[PDB]
Design a protein around this ligand. Structure first.
Ligand SMILES: COc1ncnc(OC)c1C(=O)Nc1nc(C(F)(F)F)c(-c2ccnc(C(C)(C)C#N)c2)s1
Ligand SMILES: COc1ncnc(OC)c1C(=O)Nc1nc(C(F)(F)F)c(-c2ccnc(C(C)(C)C#N)c2)s1
Ligand SMILES: COc1ncnc(OC)c1C(=O)Nc1nc(C(F)(F)F)c(-c2ccnc(C(C)(C)C#N)c2)s1
Ligand SMILES: COc1ncnc(OC)c1C(=O)Nc1nc(C(F)(F)F)c(-c2ccnc(C(C)(C)C#N)c2)s1
Ligand SMILES: COc1ncnc(OC)c1C(=O)Nc1nc(C(F)(F)F)c(-c2ccnc(C(C)(C)C#N)c2)s1
Ligand SMILES: COc1ncnc(OC)c1C(=O)Nc1nc(C(F)(F)F)c(-c2ccnc(C(C)(C)C#N)c2)s1
Ligand SMILES: COc1ncnc(OC)c1C(=O)Nc1nc(C(F)(F)F)c(-c2ccnc(C(C)(C)C#N)c2)s1
Lengths: 150, 74, 74
């Protein structure tokens, strides 16, 4: 990333800043290799082993299933409207984006989404919220697995 | 990652101390993930912000687990 | 640390009661950290504010691990 940032900077690319900032951040992250036995970077040093194995990929598969299914279920419930459409759950991609932003704590759920069935829409939205929370908390208790002695 | 702009608060992560303050009060629950972007790489900006949040949550929970486990008996 | 100013005073940490109220609202997540409080020593003011935040978080964490005390079998 660093050498690519340099090559893109001496060329007339304004896309070098992305690689340079990513390289800076990844280097500050690689600073873990030197501080693994410091009792404060313990959780990172051990979740290099725990979370990278399979639980994060199981979580990713189930989460993609949740996202795609609920994106279809919510985009289907929305009525074509005359062009902000009164609904941010418009096409399938907009519903998938809203759901992703939701599990990323970037969104907002409103009862007004221009649906013929607003109660069913709200039901499925809250169901998605609760299911993604269950998923996240499974992964959380997996990553922690304290038994602090062990 | 934040572009200079002609001096009302176009951004929120402007000067360096501004960014450090917004990250600190993002940690202690007084901050918002959705601010005036004003950046030209907004997806990279939000990726780095959510990465900050996740890594500092993992760090906070690591310290909290060390406390709740090791010191209950020693 | 706050200087008398001509009547919003540029500072919500004015009299002793206003500072006590701001600090209480802070530990109640009702507040906000501003680095602009009309002070001759803004870095010392910021240091003491963050010290208060961290100390109240330590107290809260003590009470948290106390009332949780999991040992979930027990
Ligand atoms: C000791 O750690 C630090 N100290 C000071 N500064 C730092 O960064 C400025 C850092 C640091 O860890 N930075 C990072 N960079 C990146 C990169 F993606 F860019 F590679 C990180 C990364 C890579 C892969 N998956 C994630 C998760 C799963 C968390 C997500 N989402 C995050 S993490
Ligand atoms: C792998 O899961 C998925 N993948 C892709 N898409 C999906 O849905 C679009 C899904 C999914 O889970 N769907 C759901 N349907 C319904 C229902 F309305 F039929 F009940 C769900 C529901 C609603 C309320 N209470 C519960 C229980 C009782 C379990 C609790 N608590 C379950 S959940
Ligand atoms: C309706 O909301 C949801 N429904 C179902 N599942 C969900 O999560 C699985 C969610 C949800 O809110 N998720 C979130 N993700 C993140 C992020 F870490 F990525 F930023 C969240 C966030 C954002 C800003 N500040 C924090 C603090 C500092 C408080 C911490 N820690 C956390 S919040
Ligand atoms: C963004 O996340 C947060 N940021 C800051 N503060 C927070 O606390 C309020 C939160 C937070 O977790 N909110 C939540 N609400 C709920 C709900 F039950 F109501 F659906 C959550 C939920 C959903 C699904 N399964 C659980 C299990 C069974 C694992 C438990 N327990 C909990 S989670
Ligand atoms: C406000 O409540 C929240 N709302 C949403 N998200 C949150 O998490 C990001 C939080 C939250 O608890 N934030 C915290 N910030 C800090 C700070 F160190 F930065 F001061 C916390 C802290 C401070 C001092 N000693 C600890 C010990 C070592 C006891 C532990 N463990 C933890 S705790
Ligand atoms: C600078 O902030 C601090 N400095 C030192 N100590 C502190 O607390 C000891 C604090 C602090 O933020 N305290 C807080 N108190 C409360 C309250 F529960 F009373 F509402 C907070 C709150 C408010 C709104 N939503 C929540 C969620 C739903 C996320 C939860 N849970 C928590 S936050
Ligand atoms: C990232 O998570 C962490 N990592 C390391 N240390 C941590 O705590 C210091 C944390 C964390 O989230 N701490 C908490 N913050 C708060 C808040 F009040 F501010 F909202 C907590 C809270 C909320 C509501 N009622 C209580 C009572 C008074 C019942 C208790 N007990 C405590 S708990």
């Amino acid at each position: 990333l660093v050498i690519l940032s340099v090559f893109l900077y001496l060329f007339a690319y304004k896309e070098y800043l992305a690689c340079l900032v990513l390289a800076m951040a990844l280097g500050w992250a690689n600073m873990l290799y030197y501080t693994r036995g410091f009792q404060s970077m313990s959780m990172y040093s051990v979740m290099i082993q725990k979370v990278i194995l399979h639980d994060v990929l199981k979580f990713l598969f189930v989460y993609i299933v949740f996202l795609l299914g609920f994106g279809v279920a919510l985009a289907s419930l929305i009525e074509k409207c005359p062009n902000k459409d009164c609904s941010s759950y418009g096409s399938f991609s907009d519903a998938v984006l809203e759901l992703f932003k939701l599990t990323i704590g970037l969104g907002d759920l409103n009862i007004q989404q221009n649906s013929k069935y607003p109660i069913l829409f709200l039901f499925l939205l809250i169901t998605y919220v609760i299911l993604t929370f269950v998923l996240l908390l499974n992964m959380l208790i997996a990553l922690m697995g304290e038994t602090v002695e062990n």
